[PDB]
């Protein structure tokens, strides 16, 4: 079924119905007036960030054998992986861009809902996810709560509860134990038969929308367009 969408719910309703039980939701009317929503174009990103060095993941999925991580300027990333007919999938993923480029922090806000946590605001981690259509983040789980805010473009997102972990066949290794062995959109059901019947939620996340990913909820994300998302990891 589809992740529910709520317009600016109260703090208490979010706490009781979503945060405490660990249920996903999309929040509307919250980030739709970030200055980023109107300001961030490729040209703006080049002007403010183009000369800075960023880590880039190259390859279809980080679970692939040919996948690698490199460094280049934001201008180079845009030129090679976005505008010119790219040879490979590149993704400026999981990067603390706002600590590197404080000017861009002026264009975003931490959602007020994160104050319902038991952690310090100073310890919230903010990451950029910027890439072309077709980037894929394989199914995995994270150790904090997350607000994933969509700024540019759309993402297809699949969510599996931590109760379903058995049917997701986590990797055995220590580096990949938070990651499923299954390719969500083309699962090998001969090797991973339990996956087929496992229930899930899905959504297309559009600009101005916030997805709440409860701590340890398994998530899979594919960009449908040129995309820019901002995540907030909080407790
Ligand atoms: O946006 C993506 O491709 C993947 N995002 C995340 O895994 C996250 O925000 O924790
Ligand atoms: Mn994640």
Numbering used by the authors: 182 to 416
Paper text:
JMJD5 is a JmjC domain-containing protein, present in both the nucleus and the cytoplasm. Building from an extensive peptide-based screen for potential JMJD5 substrates, our results provide evidence that JMJD5 is a JmjC-hydroxylase, catalysing the stereoselective C-3 hydroxylation of arginyl residues in sequences from proteins involved in chromatin stability (RCCD1) and translation (RPS6). Consistent with previous reports, JMJD5 residues 174–416 fold into mixed helical and β-strand topology comprising seven α-helices, 13 β-strands and 3 310 helices.
While all of our 'productive' complexes (1/A, 3 and 4) are consistent with those reported for other JmjC-hydroxylases in terms of the relationship between the active site metal and the oxidised C–H bond, neither the 'productive' nor the 'non-productive' complex structures appear to be consistent with stereoselectively favoured efficient metal-based backbone hydrolysis reactions.
